[PDB]
Assembly symmetry: D2
Homo-oligomer: 356 residues x 4
């Protein structure tokens, strides 16, 4: 069992990092190009990022749903800046229009400055308290229940969603986060726990922690990983692309990016930035795991680099740990979606082996 | 100058009111039908209702935008249940994908039970205080300002919308409401003031009140009206159709709907229900102005009934009062969009006279 | 088993016959409206007419194929004005793009003036000879065979269609015609035999004739009927709609239509135009011939309440008719009217769609 | 003045020539991908090839017209296998549906076996006699005339097309062919004469000949060229890409392809295969003009290879001869459409300089 996702670059796209050379602006036409490419190639879905640097996820996902047949959309909900009852009605409507193709990514918000710009002034513990109260209302409302809820942060009275979703009991909940509060929330309410591309040993420890917490609640959760990928026909070509991707990066931009990550209140971001510490040398932190992406890009900071045999082998290693969802990306997002499907799909389990 | 809108029945559609006989469920295909009908017939735009009884406005409008060329979407924002910065980003993204076809309807929420289900426990004056603070943030954020705002209800710090909208300074704000708080808010911040289909004398008084208040703020506002329409080739056919529309309505339905409106906290809803009082006699409150819709339906509760000459004549009276936007609807919404465009457009000003 | 089709008005649409009042021109947007209506309402497919007065069937059908999900397209081929190998490749591409939603209507051409305008100067017997030779090449080419064929009219040598169709052995062949040559052709090569809306006794005789010939060829053919439909909630409303449909028709237009039909070398058109002789328009219970007063081709309509309309359909079904191709004025609104009033009274899956 | 076209691979696509390795099947989805890329990237149009090895041109263009906004479609008509009146009606319908985006490529048919497979048994002179009679009927029918014509090959009597086209007097006629009959037909009836990518000196001679013949008819024709393009950021990358494109070609495929080109009765095809003769050495017949494509591919068999500066300079040479249309292609067609648009458009005249 394996779900392979792609990524919609709603914050921008291009050939290189840290420079405007060869940059592609986010347009409806280009988003349509990437989404329809992923649809026809047979990817399970696409992850749509959310944040101040992105166009709105819900507008994009809804606009592309009628233009695609099978592709699923992993769209982010952001508790604390929208009413849970309103959020559930949006989730139901999009799930209904898409005929059950909506997936939910629970995003807590790691940048306090970004959160204060949205009107939320909560501490790290308070953000997860809101998310816990949010998910309880959202899950119960989508199951047809008239919800009365009075917690520390959220209060609703007779909350209903009159239009039930297609997927039961509700669209699957995906969630990522590395703090103790995050792991407790994942073990109790979510369906899939997502992690960024740490080395296999570190990933295994995070998964074991979630399993133990989930077992105490009598639940099991599935696991997914988010990874950039630079795959070519030969390993030499792949590594040249990795060097070419970050050649135009200045040392000033590396210093500014690391200082901005230090201001983030996110344990996942602190772990991702601690793999390189803004150092251009020794970026291969593990076999075929290259951390050059994290020099500038925020969030996902590691990439699998190599020929198809090497990339599939690293995928198999993550798969052997219990991971069933893989969310890949590449620069630029259109071309690399074709490249990954044509070079790696035949080496993956069904149905990806037969798609190519 | 005149803009003629149609209506997207996101809360359901059918041939009759108050019954499930001959009802059309809200599907993507059917909404596509109505929106594409309105686009090709030459309607200026469509109004999309919002509320607990509707599918989500933002998901619907975004899904239909790539499937239409010229048609504009009058979409509702609801201050108090969503962050103003997030709402601004959504408007910008939809305005960008549509290439400047987005119009905003500011909705305060007249049903206290619906609002408490959304997590809002505000009084009537507090709801208008929130909307005042919400609109101030939203308007400035869409103009490129990094906004700091600390009011009674909303507080943002470094609120930014990085993607500017297509329409300047922002997508136009349409607003409806009959209370004194509503008239102050409309005179200060909105672009078009909307009213439901009251008789011309009452409409003139509401328009005169708004003009006077807007002058104190050094502004002028445009005016629009919302009406159902039952137009046939002869007056007898129109009046026969109007009778058939409410033949299945029972007294229990009338009592249940009217008592439900008593719980509503809306001045505009209270004015609309005071026209008919839940009684089936004397439903023609003015020449060719029939209030039979408001027996069950909430919100717009009056319709123009007559032959094309009479309907066009009633439209001119409203235009002579200063009304420039007309938002029409009919049952069922697909067929009646064709009927109005084929029977009434040739009798209206340009460009509607030349479309046929 | 029953297939209910609708109709794409590619030659024009409106509310009334014989007048330009309330007419809807053929645009991409309006064609999109009718096709998407038919798709979402659950119609099996749409028949797309062909002729000098229509937009080209292949262009329209291709343009609507990516905008529809389940709807089938009954598209016409015209032997004698296009190479059979070229026609076969077009059928294959459209069938592949549509994922097997293409249906083929074989049209021989009943208007000699229109045929001479396209460059074909064949007699009535010559038209069916060309069609017979056309279909033999077309059917074999789509089955992957490199075809060598040298007939009286058509000659191909190493004719191949490299892209195989989705439907096997080829997209189904629908054909209509009342002559003895047409019946021989239908019994030998076609899959569905279509007739216009004659009264049941006349329809039954034509079906019996095709059945006997098909048994001699060791085949069975399915049967379909083409019918206009005017259905309202009560019979009085339906008949009022029928009267309103033809109120703008004078006798100058009637004489122009009948004189035009006197030049058609078509057996199915003369049988259709002999039911009214240019009053007493109800030639059978709930079968009204007012449509054929101007419109060439389909000339009868079922008029009545849903119970009456379904009953007339049930009578046709009991004779062996499995395909029904309906239409109404205007074609968008009436597609909804038929689906909401008659589908619940029809067999599966139409009973469950509404 | 310059119009830059791309190409729809309706006969198949892939990463390499002469092998099925890394091949992309022609699907509706993939054609939608290529066409929409060219539309959003700003190409004037796409050329759609015709022939036994392709999916039908008219079905494809009709399928993509509603899915694109500005892109033009250069579609081929083959006289001798379809009635001119029927063909004119198809052009009118597609021109009307596309709102005047249809361009016509007149194709005579160079393969006698393909022509005999379609039922045409004509010699080279007879094919041009048929085409001459075909175009006269087609052009006049589209101008509203009821045409009576009795020629050597074609006879129509009261031929009419009731639906007039959008472009007047008819959609522009593009034509390619190098024989004396082709040059007479182009100078007499067509709007744009197209040639394949021969060296600049040979192209200049052909253009001067077509100019002289057209002047005797008191006409001027525009000129276009069809070329493959392999452009990368550096010249070394381009030539390695050119070498890799034909590395998997075996000599049993070159011999089987050259023997089939001999059977062709096509002057232009004969000149194209005379540039290389099937040899793998000295394929650069002119500065940055590489003939490696014509080793297998029938028809267009020369490519521009180099860095953006070199490719732009070769384009300028052809333009200096009077060429205003450039029809480009690349492997694979989706990726290379972006590559050409991002590397060469800024070096071209307006509007291509401002698109990037
Ligand atoms: C796969 C994945 C996807 C994420 N997507 C987003 C996103 O779109 N926007 C965002 O702000 N944070 C995103 N995050 C980060 C977390 O959702 C959250 O914002 C925060 O960083 C978690 O804090 P914590 O790790 O200290 O518990 C994502 C994390 C993961 C693992
Ligand atoms: C044209 C128009 C459209 C409206 N649309 C909505 C709507 O979609 N949802 C809603 O809850 N209220 C709608 N309203 C009503 C107001 O937005 C609001 O809910 C309330 O009635 C205003 O309160 P007030 O009348 O006491 O000033 C609309 C009003 C008008 C005139
Ligand atoms: C259901 C049906 C559909 C037809 N559709 C067309 C059409 O679209 N265009 C057309 O020219 N003829 C059409 N025809 C007519 C026949 O295909 C053909 O032109 C002629 O009338 C048959 O010749 P015959 O009756 O003399 O044997 C149709 C006939 C039937 C019964
Ligand atoms: C730019 C261009 C495009 C062409 N496209 C086609 C095509 O789509 N199909 C085809 O069969 N021939 C095509 N040809 C070739 C001619 O249309 C014709 O078939 C033949 O090869 C020319 O004959 P001639 O050179 O002896 O005069 C094309 C030629 C050119 C220059």
């Amino acid at each position: 069992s394996m779900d392979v996702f792609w990524f919609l670059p709603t914050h921008g796209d291009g050939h290189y990092l840290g420079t405007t050379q060869g940059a592609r602006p986010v347009t409806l036409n280009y988003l349509k190009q990437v989404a329809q490419a992923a649809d026809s190639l047979g990817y399970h879905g696409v992850l749509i990022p959310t944040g101040r640097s992105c166009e709105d996820s819900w507008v994009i996902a809804s606009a592309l749903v009628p233009l695609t047949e099978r592709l699923r959309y992993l769209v982010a909900i952001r508790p604390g800046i929208i009413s849970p009852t309103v959020s559930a009605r949006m989730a139901a409507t999009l799930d209904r229009l898409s005929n059950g193709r909506l997936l939910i990514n629970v995003v807590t918000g790691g940048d306090p400055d970004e959160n204060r710009g949205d009107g939320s002034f909560l501490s790290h513990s308070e953000r997860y308290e809101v998310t816990d109260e949010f998910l309880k209302i959202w899950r119960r409302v989508l199951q047809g229940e008239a919800v009365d809820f009075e917690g520390k942060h959220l209060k609703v009275q007779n909350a209903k969603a009159l239009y039930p979703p297609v997927q039961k009991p509700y669209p699957p909940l995906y969630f990522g986060g590395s703090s103790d509060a995050a792991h407790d929330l994942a073990a109790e309410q979510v369906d899939v726990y997502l992690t960024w591309g740490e080395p296999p040993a570190a990933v295994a420890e995070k998964l074991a922690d979630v399993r133990e917490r989930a077992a105490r609640h009598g639940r099991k959760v599935k696991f997914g990983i988010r990874l950039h990928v630079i795959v070519r026909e030969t390993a030499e070509e792949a590594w040249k692309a990795a060097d070419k991707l970050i050649e135009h990066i200045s040392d000033e931009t590396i210093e500014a990016a690391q200082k901005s990550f230090s201001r983030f209140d996110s344990e996942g971001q602190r772990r991702m930035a601690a793999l390189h510490d803004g150092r251009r040398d020794n970026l291969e932190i593990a076999p075929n795991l290259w951390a050059g992406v994290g020099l500038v890009r925020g969030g996902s900071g590691t990439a699998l680099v190599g020929d198809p045999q090497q990339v599939a082998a690293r995928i198999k290693e993550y798969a052997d740990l219990g991971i069933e969802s893989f969310i890949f990306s590449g620069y630029p997002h259109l071309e690399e979606a074709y490249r990954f499907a044509e070079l790696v799909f035949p080496l993956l389990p069904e149905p990806y082996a037969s798609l190519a």
